[PDB]
């Protein structure tokens, strides 16, 4: 099946996509890496010290780079801790879930959101490679070669607790 190899927690600065409406469309350009992996980028609004309710989920293959699939719910936010509630459409933040239109999973920052939370947004990419090999415990040398662009990104919120290995 798809045996996980680990997760990379990197930070990407969003790029403004010129829009037709009054809203701000933000895109976090993902490196075109052709390896078996899952890409979950969390939209962190630094100014409000909170995150958006849903995260953009992408998937990569050995013959295709990260391609958008769906906008899954944010289960483990960077801040959270029940001190505050995640930012929703009501708060002026929405991720489009369209696969037909060229957008997705780009963040929509409507004028309804705090002035100016859009410029404060930062991505927390959770790149998690996998392999068909059950005997592989970490990414091999040629896989780390292909993932160079992701590996060279700055670390963002990488946890202190290293999970235990299968015993």
Ligand X SMILES: *[C@@H]1O[C@H](CO)[C@@H](O[C@@H]2O[C@H](CO)[C@@H](O)[C@H](O)[C@H]2NC(C)=O)[C@H](O)[C@H]1NC(C)=O
Ligand Y SMILES: *[C@@H]1O[C@H](CO)[C@@H](O[C@@H]2O[C@H](CO)[C@@H](O[C@H]3O[C@H](CO)[C@@H](O)[C@H](O)[C@@H]3O)[C@H](O)[C@H]2NC(C)=O)[C@H](O)[C@H]1NC(C)=O
Ligand Z SMILES: *[C@@H]1O[C@H](CO)[C@@H](O)[C@H](O)[C@H]1NC(C)=O
Would you tell me which residues interact with ligand Y (CB under 6 A)? 2, 36, 62, 131-132
User: Given the complex with ligand Z, which of 71 and 121 has the nearer CB atom?
Assistant: 71
User: Given the complex with ligand X, which of 40 and 131 has the nearer CB atom?
Assistant: 40
- Is 141 exposed, middle or buried, given 0-12, 13-18 or 19+ CB atoms closer than 10 A? exposed
Which option in ligand Y, a second copy, ligand Z, none does residue 62 bind, with CB closer than 5 to 8 A by kind?
ligand Y
> Does 71 contact ligand Z by CB under 6 A?
yes
Q: Where are the beta strands (DSSP E) in 110-158?
A: 121-131
Residue 35's nearest CA partner among 122, 154, 146 is: 146
Report d(CA 154, CA 167) in Å as an integer.
Answer: 32
- Which residues have C-beta within 8 Å of that of residue 145, sequence separation ≥ 6? none
Residues numbered 102-161 forming contacts with ligand Z, rule: CB under 6 A: none
Residues that bind a second copy (CB under 8 A): 1-10, 128, 138-139, 151, 155, 158-167
Residues that bind ligand Z (CB under 6 A): 54, 70-71, 97
């Amino acid at each position: 099946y798809r045996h996980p190899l680990g997760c990379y927690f990197k930070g990407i600065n969003p790029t403004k996509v010129p829009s037709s409406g009054s809203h701000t469309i933000l895109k976090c350009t993902l490196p075109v890496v052709k390896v078996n992996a899952s890409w979950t980028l969390e939209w962190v609004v630094v100014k409000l010290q909170n995150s958006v309710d849903v995260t953009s989920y992408y998937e990569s293959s050995p013959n295709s780079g990260p391609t958008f699939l769906r906008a899954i719910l944010n289960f483990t936010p960077m801040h959270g801790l029940r001190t505050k509630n995640l930012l929703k459409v009501k708060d002026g933040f929405q991720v489009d879930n369209s696969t037909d239109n060229g957008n997705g999973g780009n963040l929509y920052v409507y004028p309804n959101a705090t002035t100016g939370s859009a410029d404060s947004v930062r991505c927390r990419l959770r790149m998690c490679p996998w392999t068909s090999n059950s005997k592989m415990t970490a990414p091999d040398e040629e896989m780390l070669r292909k993932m160079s662009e992701v590996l060279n990104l700055p670390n963002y919120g990488v946890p202190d607790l290293t999970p235990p290995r299968r015993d």
